[PDB]
Design a protein around this ligand. Structure first.
Ligand SMILES: CCCCCCCC/C=C\CCCCCCCC(=O)O[C@H](COC(=O)CCCCCCCCCCCCCCC)COP(=O)([O-])O[C@@H]1[C@H](O)[C@H](O)[C@H](O)[C@H](O)[C@H]1O
Ligand SMILES: *[C@@H]1O[C@H](CO)[C@@H](O[C@@H]2O[C@H](CO)[C@@H](O[C@@H]3O[C@H](CO)[C@@H](O)[C@H](O)[C@@H]3O)[C@H](O)[C@H]2NC(C)=O)[C@H](O)[C@H]1NC(C)=O
Ligand SMILES: *[C@@H]1O[C@H](CO)[C@@H](O)[C@H](O)[C@H]1NC(C)=O
Ligand SMILES: *[C@@H]1O[C@H](CO)[C@@H](O)[C@H](O)[C@H]1NC(C)=O
Ligand SMILES: [Mg+2]
Lengths: 1035, 328
């Protein structure tokens, strides 16, 4: 059990605790270089290229220069290492900034300035207004009555509203002064550190008495103090034991699914490479036994038994056949990846003009995985919405207002101007004052509330625990009914610039089950008004029979409901003098604890609010981001499932679900109570929710279902598996009241139990854990902290830019990568397997079929540019046609363009191209090509012709592969052949290429390699055209 | 974040381009014009190849009942053979004398690199310092081998003469030129004699001959322009072969001053000085006489190949045409 002793730095130093410094980075100045461990081992290609480098080092078994594989391996390893060094050094700056944050600490007898590192468990601290909470502390005292504190938990959840926090009653009256805090010696035996943010179990031992503790008295690290001059608390969890850091995940290394596919399909090439070399090695042992031992011209001294000669060339044939897995593939993918990323950076249709924030590709390695997304897990507030929540319409008295019929707001100086109200009749009616209901309506909004004033620098800012109330008070303020300030006994409100300080005699509290609030205020004349405001259903239960506007307001509410607006009913009363005096005595008798204080308070609360007079209703709009409902429909057409993971309330989350059209009237909403029975039923025995299509669950219910011995572990995987099956059989899933770790748990659950490619999008620190956990992580820009942005692979500002990232950039990056991989392997299996065929005609001696200079420059100068440009410019359809047809996204979702079948089909194509490129020239020189003093079918001519036919054939194949024939694409394909034939014509090889039989041999080889390929390409599309082909044809 | 991206075609992914679609109006023609070009070329090469007169004599004599088996085991080192052959059709124009070796892997890795091109280029430093490439034949006893390597060592050292057995039965000797049988670049660029001096004897001072060579490289030919590293026979040999079965140019029979055929039809005798042993590795020596053609040499593989590829291209177009029309 945890144990904290205040003002005792040596209590439990007798390891288990943690200092209040944070280590988010992953590397030091020394252990960074061992990053080679991660690079080398995870990608077996790097290990194979390492083996080749060693294998080419020893002169005993060597056929190619090792300088040519060290330089690219350094480039391959260097760039990836450089990328992770910039990523890690950035994490060093954020850790240093947080760790150097300032806080006041109880030194010996006084409060002194200190940094966030110096804080430790059992340390008493003092925090001021707008100061970050440096650790999970226990509130001891505050600058306002009852040791009250308001805190903004914007990193625990994405909400900017204030959270109420109270301290222990005993500590409130004693630890007010600095003197008593310094000598304070409180012992706490609380829970062990965990990731739970809503629950806290513990007790405070002090003054020979034990006081239980709750989460209301505990301020957590990721919070900010607001609306209180200062507060004091003792650190309980520090640094890494804090619930904010237990609600965080490791920065894992993210690599694409295609990256895993190349790994498994490069294993097979290794098997092929070893099997080929072993087979050729065996033949040499047999060949050297019969033909090589009796061949006097092959004598070279140093008698080696045929078995040893076979053993020796096995390593010669690994080196000869090394480009079965070429190092240029991974050098060029880094060029493709970097260029594809910069198109996201450069996009103007993902550039937010007014915030001047373009899209950013912070991770350049995952571009083609954007075309693979199966699921999207999105934050709600700031991601789907704007965090703007304004007053849109109102039904006051009977008539509905805010219909744009016929604002300056200069008639009242308090109007901040935020409100975008358009109707002018309301403003005319307010100034005219021809109807008391209008003045009474906006008065209620500016009095019946819990909002608090700032009055800092002469600005009348409002901070509220309920975003609904904050908007209503702002609306009333804009309409002249400015809530100036409030003390304990009286509330001050300005009416048309006239000061009017009223005295409040009671403030009915607001509860989730209560669904309403009221305030009883005595007017200066003496009249008592019970200004009540609450939910639509509860209010109508308490209506006087005289109310004639009941039906009309109900009709107005239906109009507002259809717009998915938030509505609240407004009411006053006219309680009498003696009646309140009798009740005021009764009300005080109910405030005492007595037995429970809940039944009595509810009883008196019920009787207060009977027979009320309706004023109508309000209409608050929780603004969505532009193009959000269009985005959700567009991505839904692409078969992408969008899940909303929010720290907000269920009611707010469900309201935005309908506003986003994620939920419609067709959907039936399943709740945690409904889910639990369905899951429980399956244990005692696809899910019926396959037809329900909606799922609204709370973070509290996630733990109940997730349940966070061997038989117990069996039920853990079973219950998690069933939930993922149910949640995946639903059109929309909204998880609410979830902590930052619970967000990543849901993303993880889909990853493990569905093997789906997941995207996580959000803003603020609440979403960093799931942005780090998903396959792709997007960070919405706008948070000054920039915590989701700096932990994300990509970061734009508007949610609607998800359309172009996935359907345009992600779709093309998948097409442009699979096209790149299939050709690049093709061009290198055709290249290198000519050596395999020549082994049957040179004693299996590992003699290369090309000149040494051709082998080095093949993937550098002759087949390099065309495939890189095709990997950076190839579009099957335009961007407009990409968004107009989201169904083209299913191409990558189903993994169609890169497979074992697609990969092996490029093995056969390379195998057959090498076969033709060697055996047509072989037949042409088995029959004595162009015999004369200038062409005796030498070896150089054999090498030059196959290389000449190889360069043309592969460079034509990329031309047939390219669909977006830009000029730079045309120049590269033709320039590669022109460059090749320009190098070997004085800027041996020239002699062969001046003779008709040599050129007619190349033409025959090139056609026999390409001309069949046109047949399958044309035959396949005609019989089985692709969706891109149909759009291209109909373009 | 930062300012607006600049509006350019490349960065905005809107570069002008063409979207070529493999339509039946584009692939079907190229599948038919190819078949209409490959057939006439296939016929043109095939007919020209079959219009080339050529005779190939296998004088290794491994199989008994041949008048050269005595030289398989030459108890006396100078061994000679006489093979009589008849040319039915008179050869016309220039006639080339090639010798052919079978199952002689001149492309072997241990054999191809066994040379010092720097020495063959005529480098004084490499003249007396053979490279490790020609390791087994760098030096004989104390001083280095001038043509070092398995290549120069195993040079073809047979001698071939042809006589016309006329009506009188008296063998008329036949002129055979040994110049101009190698690449121009090989004679003048790739191969050169060491610099300095006037006589080849002093230039190759302190350099042993190859062990298998009967005589040194000083006087490979009487003409100083054909002796040393620039010898035509030696140069032709060093130009290794791509495949085990190959033939190398030996002598040229230029056009006769008279209008009569260069090698008139009749009885011919091949007088060969059997020197090169090939029967250990089951290799076959041959002598080839062939006549020049305005399209190079003889190659029925290619001519037949275009007929097959050209015909298949024509047929593939028809098949593609039928598939298209059914799926139109
Ligand atoms: C006229 C038109 C055409 C002009 C054309 C102009 C020229 C082309 C210009 C640009 C296109 C990209 C060219 C680079 C292609 C990859 C190079 C490569 O892999 O070479 C490798 C070796 O060469 C090198 O050392 C170069 C490495 C550094 C490359 C720097 C990249 C810069 C990219 C700039 C892009 C700008 C792009 C800008 C775009 C706007 C090839 O190795 P391997 O696979 O053939 O064989 C390996 C290994 O290498 C050893 O050989 C060993 O034998 C081992 O066993 C074997 O497995
Ligand atoms: C033509 O070339 C052949 C090579 O195929 C020559 O045969 C080779 O001759 C050398 C020496 O003349 C032999 O080397 C050594 O000779 C000594 C005798 O001095 C012998 O006892 C050793 O055992 C060793 O072989 C070599 O073995 C031999 N090779 C073969 C395959 O016979 C031939 O001499 C050349 N003839 C002419 C006329 O140029
Ligand atoms: C070949 O010719 C020579 C002389 O010309 C002669 O001695 C020999 O008998 C002939 N052999 C055959 C088989 O004709
Ligand atoms: C063959 O050539 C040799 C060498 O010059 C010569 O001695 C002989 O007379 C020629 N004729 C034969 C062997 O019939
Ligand atoms: Mg948010």
């Amino acid at each position: 059990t945890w144990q904290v002793k205040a003002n005792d730095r040596k209590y439990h130093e007798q390891s288990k605790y943690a200092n209040n410094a944070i280590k988010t980075y992953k590397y030091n100045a020394f252990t960074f270089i061992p990053m080679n461990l991660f690079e080398q081992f995870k990608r077996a290609a790097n290990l194979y290229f390492l083996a080749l480098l060693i294998l080419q080092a020893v002169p005993q078994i060597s056929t190619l220069a090792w300088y040519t594989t060290l330089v690219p391996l350094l480039v391959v390893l260097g760039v990836t290492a450089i990328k992770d060094l910039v990523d890690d050094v950035a994490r060093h700056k954020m850790d240093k900034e947080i760790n150097n944050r300032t806080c006041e600490v109880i030194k010996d007898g006084r409060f002194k300035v200190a940094k966030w590192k110096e804080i430790q468990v059992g340390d008493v601290i003092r925090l001021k207004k707008n100061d970050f909470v440096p650790a999970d502390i226990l509130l001891l005292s505050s600058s306002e009555p009852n040791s009250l504190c308001y805190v903004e938990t914007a990193e625990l959840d994405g909400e900017t509203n204030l959270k109420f926090k109270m301290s222990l009653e005993i500590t409130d009256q004693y630890l007010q002064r600095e003197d008593t805090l310094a000598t304070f010696d409180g012992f706490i035996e609380c829970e062990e550190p965990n990731n739970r943010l809503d629950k806290f179990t513990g007790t405070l031992f002090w003054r020979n008495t034990s006081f239980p503790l709750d989460a209301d008295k505990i301020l957590l690290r990721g919070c900010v103090i607001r609306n209180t001059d200062f507060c004091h608390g003792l650190v309980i969890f520090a640094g890494a034991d804090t619930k904010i850091m237990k609600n965080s995940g490791k920065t894992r290394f993210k690599r694409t699914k295609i990256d895993y596919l190349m790994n498994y399909m490069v294993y097979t090439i290794f098997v092929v490479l070893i099997l080929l070399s072993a087979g050729l090695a065996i033949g040499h042992a047999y060949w050297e036994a019969q033909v090589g031992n009796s061949s006097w011209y092959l004598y070279d001294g140093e008698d080696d038994t045929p078995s040893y000669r076979g053993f020796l060339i096995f390593w010669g044939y690994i080196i000869v056949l090394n480009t079965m897995v070429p190092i240029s593939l991974y050098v060029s993918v880094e060029v493709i990846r970097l260029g594809q990323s910069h198109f996201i950076n450069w996009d103007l249709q993902m550039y937010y003009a007014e915030k001047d924030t373009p899209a950013k590709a912070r991770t350049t390695t995952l571009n083609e995985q954007l075309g693979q997304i199966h699921y999207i897990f999105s934050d709600k507030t700031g991601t789907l919405t704007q965090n703007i929540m304004t007053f849109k319409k109102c039904c006051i008295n009977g008539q509905i207002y805010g219909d744009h019929r016929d604002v300056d707001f200069s008639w009242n100086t308090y109007a901040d101007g935020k409100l975008a109200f358009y109707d002018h009749y309301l403003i005319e009616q307010i100034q005219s004052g021809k109807e008391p209901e209008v003045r009474q309506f906006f008065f209620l909004l500016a009095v019946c509330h819990t909002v608090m004033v700032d009055r800092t620098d002469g600005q009348l800012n409002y901070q509220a625990a309920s975003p609904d109330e904050g908007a209503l008070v702002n609306a009333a303020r804009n309409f002249g009914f400015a809530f100036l300030a409030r003390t304990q006994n009286t509330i001050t409100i300005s009416e048309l610039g006239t000061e009017r300080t009223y005295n409040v005699l009671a403030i009915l509290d607001f509860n989730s089950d209560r669904k309403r609030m009221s305030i009883i205020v005595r007017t200066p004349e003496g009249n008592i008004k019970l200004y009540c405001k609450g939910a639509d259903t509860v209010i109508y239960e308490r209506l006087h029979r005289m109310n004639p506007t009941k039906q009309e307001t109900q009709d107005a509410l239906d109009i507002f409901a259809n717009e998915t607006l938030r509505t609240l009913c407004l009411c006053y009363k006219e309680i009498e003098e003696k009646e309140f005096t009798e009740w005021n005595k009764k009300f005080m008798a109910a405030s005492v604890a007595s037995t429970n204080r809940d039944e009595a308070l509810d009883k008196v609360y019920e009787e207060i609010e009977k027979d009320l007079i309706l004023l109508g209703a309000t209409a608050i709009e929780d603004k969505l981001q532009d193009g959000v409902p269009e985005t959700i429909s567009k991505l839904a057409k692409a078969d992408i499932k969008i899940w909303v993971l929010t720290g907000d309330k269920k009611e707010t989350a469900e309201n935005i679900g309908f506003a986003c059209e994620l939920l419609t009237e067709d959907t039936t909403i399943c709740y945690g109570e409904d889910i639990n029975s369905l899951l429980h039923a399956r244990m005692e025995n696809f899910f019926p929710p396959g037809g329900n299509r909606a799922l609204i669950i709370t973070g509290s219910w996630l733990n109940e279902i997730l349940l966070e011995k061997r038989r117990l572990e069996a039920k853990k995987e079973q219950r998690q598996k069933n939930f993922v099956d149910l949640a995946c059989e639903c059109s929309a899933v909204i998880c609410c009241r979830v902590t930052p770790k619970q967000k990543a748990m849901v993303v993880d659950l889909v990853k493990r139990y569905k093997k789906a490619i997941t995207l996580a999008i959000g803003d603020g620190a609440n979403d960093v854990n799931m942005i780090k956990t998903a396959h792709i992580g997007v960070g919405i820009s706008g948070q000054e902290g920039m915590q989701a942005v700096m932990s994300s692979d990509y970061s734009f500002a508007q949610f609607r830019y998800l359309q172009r990232l996935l359907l345009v950039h992600g779709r093309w990056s998948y097409i442009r990568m699979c096209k790149f991989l299939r050709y690049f392997f093709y061009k290198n299996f055709a290249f290198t397997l000519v050596h395999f065929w020549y082994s049957f005609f040179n004693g299996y001696s590992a003699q290369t079929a090309y000149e040494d200079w051709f082998i080095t420059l093949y993937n550098v100068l002759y087949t390099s540019l065309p495939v890189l440009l095709m990997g950076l410019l190839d579009q099957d359809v335009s961007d407009k046609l990409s968004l107009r047809f989201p169904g083209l996204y299913i191409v990558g979702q189903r993994d169609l363009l890169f497979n074992y079948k697609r990969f092996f089909v490029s093995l056969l194509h390379g195998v057959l191209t090498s076969m033709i490129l060697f055996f047509i020239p072989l037949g042409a020189y088995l029959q004595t090509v162009g015999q004369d003093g200038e062409a005796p079918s030498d070896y150089q001519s054999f090498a030059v012709t196959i290389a000449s036919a190889l360069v043309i054939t592969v460079n034509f194949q990329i031309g047939l592969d390219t669909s977006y024939w830009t000029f730079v694409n045309a120049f590269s394909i033709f320039g590669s052949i022109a460059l090749y034939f320009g190098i070997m014509f004085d800027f041996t090889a020239s002699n062969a290429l001046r003779q008709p039989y040599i050129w007619l041999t190349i033409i025959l080889t090139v056609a026999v390699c390409l001309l069949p390929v046109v047949a399958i390409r044309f035959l396949s599309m005609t019989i089985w055209p692709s969706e891109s082909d149909k759009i291209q044809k109909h373009r | 974040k930062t300012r607006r991206p600049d509006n350019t075609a490349f960065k905005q992914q809107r570069l002008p381009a063409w979207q070529p679609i493999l339509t039946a109006g584009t692939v079907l023609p190229i599948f038919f014009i190819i078949g209409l070009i490959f057939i006439p070329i296939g016929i043109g090469i095939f007919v020209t190849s079959n219009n080339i007169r050529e005779i190939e004599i296998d004088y290794t004599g491994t199989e008994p009942s041949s008048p050269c088996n005595k030289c398989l085991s030459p108890d006396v080192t100078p061994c000679f053979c006489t093979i009589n052959f008849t040319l039915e059709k008179s050869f016309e124009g220039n006639v080339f004398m090639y010798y052919g070796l079978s199952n002689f892997y001149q492309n072997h890795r241990r054999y191809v690199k066994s040379r010092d091109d720097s020495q063959l280029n005529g480098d004084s430093s490499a003249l007396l310092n053979p490279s490790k490439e020609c390791e087994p034949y760098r030096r004989n006893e104390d001083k280095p081998i001038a043509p070092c390597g398995a290549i120069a060592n195993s040079m073809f050292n047979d001698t071939l003469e042809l006589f016309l057995i006329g009506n009188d039965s008296y063998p008329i000797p036949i002129a055979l030129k040994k110049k101009g049988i190698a690449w121009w670049t090989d004679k003048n660029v790739k191969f050169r004699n060491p610099p300095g001096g006037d006589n080849l004897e002093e230039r190759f001072k302190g350099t042993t001959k190859p062990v298998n060579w009967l005589k040194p490289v000083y006087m490979l030919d009487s003409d100083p322009d054909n002796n040393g590293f620039i010898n035509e026979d030696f140069i032709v040999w060093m130009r290794t072969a791509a495949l085990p079965t190959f033939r190398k140019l030996y002598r040229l029979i230029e056009r006769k001053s008279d209008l009569h055929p260069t090698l008139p039809a009749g009885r011919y005798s091949l007088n060969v000085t059997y020197n090169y042993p090939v029967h250990y590795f089951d290799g076959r020596k041959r002598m080839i006489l062939s006549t020049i053609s305005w399209m190079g040499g003889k190659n029925p593989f290619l001519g037949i190949a275009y007929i097959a590829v050209g015909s298949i291209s024509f047929l593939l177009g028809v098949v593609l045409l039928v598939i298209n029309h059914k799926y139109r």
